[model samples]
Target chain A: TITYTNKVANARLGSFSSLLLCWRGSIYKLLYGEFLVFIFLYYSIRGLYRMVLSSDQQLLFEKLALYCDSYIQLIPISFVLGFYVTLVVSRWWSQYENLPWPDRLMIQVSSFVEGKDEEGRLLRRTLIRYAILGQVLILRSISTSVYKRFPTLHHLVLAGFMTHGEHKQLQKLGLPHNTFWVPWVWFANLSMKAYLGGRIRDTVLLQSLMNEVCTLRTQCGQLYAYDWISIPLVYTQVVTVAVYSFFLACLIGRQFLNPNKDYPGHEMDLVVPVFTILQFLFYMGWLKVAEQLINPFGEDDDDFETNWIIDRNLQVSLLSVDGMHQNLPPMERDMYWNEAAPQPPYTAASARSRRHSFMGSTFNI
Target chain B: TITYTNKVANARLGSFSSLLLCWRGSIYKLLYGEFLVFIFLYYSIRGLYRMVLSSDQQLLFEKLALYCDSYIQLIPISFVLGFYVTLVVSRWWSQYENLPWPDRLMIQVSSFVEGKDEEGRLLRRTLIRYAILGQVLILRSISTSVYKRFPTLHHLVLAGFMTHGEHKQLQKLGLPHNTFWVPWVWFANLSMKAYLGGRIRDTVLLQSLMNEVCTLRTQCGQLYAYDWISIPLVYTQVVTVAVYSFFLACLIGRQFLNPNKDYPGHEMDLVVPVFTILQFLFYMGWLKVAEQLINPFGEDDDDFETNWIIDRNLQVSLLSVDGMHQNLPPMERDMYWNEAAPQPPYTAASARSRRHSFMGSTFNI
Candidate 1:
């Protein structure tokens, strides 16, 4: 839902300027509340100093500011933030990659599961349904939006993901360690049965199909692992402590002291802290990026569109196994079929980006 | 070459103390050279200030040191370094995962390919050979050790990865890209031929074997992609600049100034900059972790033992398909085979570590 991936494909000057204006999933959207509060606090302290505090008080305040500024740098704000954010980001990307997309499985099911008959179609549909059902069940555990949509087994039954008879059987076998593993077992059994019948011609094909299902199960397991062991609570707490304390120190540390007083870096009474604001944006925005992305299954602006993925996966899996089974487009020879050195012409926009082929690094050697 | 991953299987106090003493793959080994250079410069500057410089020159030097220290904190060294290192580490792990393990394919080939005859053995042997050959060829492109082992097509042939005829065929079919993809194409053609000859039974099985080969090919492609695209040079340059500049600043800023002048943090004449050296170790050690891990196929202490992997894969693949085919442990009833509610006993050490079984997170709810 928050994809602007296409817009920033190539680098140029002011390329990111356009992105700065984007409201949805932008740093501005996430940090506006914090930014305003930071400004408000900074001004209040500045006003209190100029109008109310006496000369002795101002001297004490300046000393306090210097102390705060000196010690705040010792907190290693960037280190903890950097390490935690990096961990979060890597886990976020891993979760995205591990998301169970049944494209390969569906393709295998379509091609290898033989016959254009009703039974063949039913078998294919049932197998894919079970595969997607497992993914949906896993999603229910992890994704808030998906969980809301499919709140109970009854809801899954009502949504046609589970039959009443199957639901009855599911309740009867009551071993309880996240029954998300159940659908995968059912998929394996059903596919094996399909192979035992003439529908699947070979054990090798069944193995391939089972391997794909296993991969999906592994992905679901990874999601579970991520959920089970978060980016260690201590690490998260350390980052939070650093970021919060640094900004709190900045309230006093970044104050515009009297210009005549001749502090080394504090040359001006410009009233507004320009660099301080930018630091807020950079550091706080960086933290915000991690915050939004930490558990992407949540329904935040930049969070993964888990609801959309659920619908899309189900629709695509169903279409692949049923509607698009053995329904590939009419085969014709590609345009440059006879050409020995065939090179497709790039569009005008992309022509400048083209380059010679990549030979090995040791091509000459 | 330096793997002690087994030693730290479970967490305990002082567990990391043993790791600190290790020289191979340790941060101390990786960063000691840079540390010496940093110390050398720090002392040279200190001697210049104390022994060589006049009082005016000393004052000017002190001002310069103070200035450097103040501004150095502005550089976001940890942020850039953390992000870059995280990128490197993730890529390193991915490369390790994508390293072609022939175990899956070997098992599939052994089970799915029929017969225990001599021809069956040969066919199995040849198939695994082609599989390892493709992986070895890819490794040659990326790994220093593998390239040293198999520097030429002649070497590959002599090593029995490919037949002389196959090497001739490979040379004849020249393409512009890296020739790693060529072996995979050969594998696909040969496997299809084997299926046609009834060495591999069933179209489904053929498809399964083909899919596994395709996965290996994809993994090989991923390695190529990772090697080709790397973390953008600009980002790496930015991180390097920030880190080196911070240390260069430290060479001046971290000096224990004369306490008489009373620079806020310089109140103590604690001759050694204990915190500064610790910071150096922490930050530089972090950067060293990234450097060691970035190109895992390189000959660094912590680099992936790719030569070992190459040898192990070849041995395992051959053993799996031929020697271990249809080889199974004699079937016998396990201790818990007849028990309805069997609970396995834990070893003496692990007994206290045992916990109740994990129900779902929302079990009570």
Candidate 2:
């Protein structure tokens, strides 16, 4: 099982190592679209006034500029870093799709199941998640470091958001913590679920896989007579935590990010996090649905389909043993599954729509 | 009308309701179903250890433990509150459907044709609005009470949210009273015109109802006309408050939920209250739309078939003096509304389709 799994998994891994510039992108969209749109709109509108006054580009570029006399070192680095991040994410999304579902699930779950990775074989998943998390923290660190490096940017107060008061308040608020943005992580899960749900319905291969998963999960034998309450309890935690975290983000952003409407320049302390500590249930929410679709073979999605995988693993476990099926019901359910199952094999050239259900159907050859 | 109104409402309610678990559901599919779903996925994964390691019995009995704690609370007691919310909605929908175009016009012309109810009792149009308002207030109160009971629910750690110190700083900055949440009553009105175009359309039934309310409101509208701006100013304050509340909820929830990562025990403060607030806004936002639709005969929906209600009211008014039809306008040509004489036998149902331009049309007759 490991041989087959590893071989196929490694093959998928090879597919993701590529450079990309053609895909429609996020960082590109945010940086070029939002910032540039703002600038373009500003300049096109401001061009009308440019001739009359010696206007500084800083006024128009303030939001994205991040430039203070000292920020010279930070700005370029942060810009490049931001750009790189977008690239990485785009690569990740593209390459990740190439990995078969089981491989992807194993990428995360193998560690939990076996308690550790024996070698670098499946270490790619950990490295990727860690690398992404580390990079984000580093980028955030750089953002903070550079902001601190440039005293002039603070004194300059190019825009309301870049003021001394703003920085001080932000720091005091502990927003620079790497997870400041992490709190909104559920948004990613939401995006994944929506993406998978919509895309899967249109993909026969994925839908069939999903149907198999659902069927296997619901089979009566999977419920070991006592696992019932775990279902709702586990799900409730996910809902509450998700709800709570969303609100916390709400409170913080409202207080800090929003410009004061009445004074227009002053900040109002609307939602204080001290009180939000009372809203601790949101942390309990699990992106159960997201994990199911994103890493379906992982333990979470495994809940729905664990029995099927266990059954498969059991077969694999005994496959190497002698006469494993000798005592079975006369091979009524053939150890050679394709021989007994009602399905044909999966072909790499099968255009995906024709992929069969039982693994043996595809692997029998 | 109340009995007729009651007949129209559907069964979205009963009595002694438990609570509403309303939250802004996933908006854009493909990603970000709603912040809630995303959160659910994340936690489900983290808690899988419980299923794997806990006694097999835990898996069965505590299965929904996570769900019960979180989202189960999301469904409101409203589902059981009123027996006829749906019935009322349907009747409201049907009433609009039944209007003869002419009667619709007549209803628009004089919703107040000052007719008696099916029981032949005099009707008070304002009483109808009072009922809707009363129910809204009741439901809002019930839901609010339920949410308040869960104190440790919505949280996100420190992002832009004010710290305890920051909250104090803001309190020192300025507020009407020391209340953290200000009631934004103005949002209701803001929602109305944005949907139904501020006044009754050329439709007769709606127009008639509008006229009655308009005429009555106008009669009482005078002495305070000198302070007209004051009313709008009050409304603005409320809207600002609601907007402020919503923004706060978003920021705080995002900061604490941190759906991307996991929280240990001490970090339990990160999840609860803020999510509750988000749910509050989510439901409230849509509720406003639903509420608006239900009252097509009032000032917002085709509310009151004002033109006819007013006409009918005027007719009733005229009847008191035995002068009904006395103003038959020496020429029918004198009876144009806006420009041309309104087509009559105005019905109310047509106004429903008009109102349904918003998100929900499920109750479409």
Candidate 3:
């Protein structure tokens, strides 16, 4: 009863508090329901993969293995990134007007009804629009300024852009393709196959991820909001994407994949987003470090302020009790009753009797 | 005057703030009623594109246009790269967080009133879930790391993740192709797409950036609040997102027109997002650089903050008003008597018969 009245009275932000609470209390907790299904699906897929592949066949399945590996990496990164980005941006953004109001009453009622349905989980399209718009401005600066931190180690990007075909062609003929593909010989083959051979999915992991991103886009936020792990899982993907796109555009479309001709010598003077996978990987990994250093707000996001939130929530909780729980009913004949209260506290029986007496005095004609 | 006080007091949310207000008020200066409709036939199509093709076409377009001989390449060397990138990324991914609170509100409200009909304008299932989870961290982080920002670049994203022919085979190829694409480029191509063609995007638009970022995320204090001209259209996009999201996703999704497979090596690293596009004429003409640069806070996003928002809204608005502007009712006796006033001064009345005075002095009772 104490908790109920306290929460009710304190619930605010247009009942968003209640709505969010109810969602978490009922719906968010139910994520375990999906987890149960995931466990079932995981074992099923793991079993299928194990049963289906042979040692040499596993080579073909490498892409699928990478997909699963990526997924695992995605979850934690999503958790941390999700927590980090949400925590930092929301707080940072709160400087605009007021903190996002979690309408408790709405949540309380809705959660009781069906918990937090998909509708409850959404940040609303309005917030998404602004969040995106703000992101454009915020990110543009980072690309220009913060990018300097990674610094160019070489003109390898231009060289690589200009030479992937020649190296891979040489690799096929057992020639020197340089030290770049030494550690990742197999993946280089796959890239060549995907690009040169154009083979399809080697596993189910890719399908799942595809489903994940596409489904996410159709709905509300996708990986941007909930799954922080996905960000790191997919960081600097554009570089890889650019490589793939350019190869197809230049090589297949215009057949511009002339190893020597692709590179303009003058272009080497410009900045390349580092060519060595180690530098790129280091940058990608260091990005999380920087993210962590700057964002202490949450586990995933790396810079969330969980402490103040707890304090604020607790304060809101305790402070909200009066408004929600103790809202008194309209006073009957306030002038007479308030004064009468000094003589004798009004009781249910006495109040009933007085109402009868009033009827007797006025209506007993 | 003919309207009942009881009805007015119990008016619904839609009554005073409705669309009827547009026409009704225009006709008679009376409050209008609002109506919303969301069609679902459109929802499935949107979802399908988002799930499968949205990001793919974007990548294809990026690849296709990299070496195109057009006016898009004619932009100023100073602003071209930055302009190209900002425009493209803004084009491709600027609206990632397209559904904020206000948009969410409308989507929900529209869902409730009209039900998800065709356009699916209100059919946000997947993305909304991510947004809720995402912003939790965004808000949390604001307290911990001040400099942490959400980073996005089309060069990295579009170049890496988007694919064409494989999408036809893969149900939702976005995550699948993208995940492998980046790693593949790293290990295989060694960041090579740059040599293929295209410059990078970057510029010196910085400084009050943090302040602007803070204002945008929070919708807090305004500097030039109403000077829409100075703000980027992307900023205003937070206000009305009906177009940005649908159009961009579609624009990018159509790139499944052609398919090819050629390894893009190191040139991928040579392209700076801001620089390359300025040299292209066609890409140049379509881009509205100045206007877009200034109005990140435009009407495109229905949820953007305005000067009037601060002037009126805030928690204080809640104190003076209740549901439908119903405040505490006047206490009959005290209202007649004027016994107590919180801040204002007033004198006591002798049986206060202001409506019909001088009927009696001692007999006034």
Docking level of model 1: acceptable
- Which stretch of 10 consecutive residues in model 2 chain B shows the poorest summed lDDT? B226-235
Q: Which rank order by DockQ, best down to worst?
A: 1, 3, 2
Distance from true location, Cα of B37 in model 3, Å = 35
Residue A210 CA error for candidate 1 (Å)?
15
lDDT of 3 by residue, B55-132 (tens): 667465456434332222222322332333344333322333332232222121111111123322222222122222
Best by DockQ: 1
TM-score of 1: 0.62
Give one digit per residue, the lDDT tens place, for model 1 in B181-212: 77677778878888888677678788888898
Q: Which 10 consecutive positions of candidate 3 chain B have the poorest summed lDDT? A: B30-39
State each model's C-alpha RMSD to the native: 8.9, 36.1, 36.9
* Residue-level lDDT tens digits of model 1 in A222-308: 988887777777777878888888888888887888888778988867856788788889888888878888887888887777777
Which pairs clash in the backbone of model 1? A204-B205, A205-B204, A205-B205
Question: Tens digit of lDDT per residue, candidate 2, span B133-239?
Answer: 22222222222221122122121002111123323423442322212111111111211222234222322322223333322322222211111111111111222
Displacement of the residue A29 alpha carbon in candidate 2, Å: 35
Error (Å) of candidate 2 at residue A77 is 46
Rank by lDDT, descending? Answer: 1, 2, 3
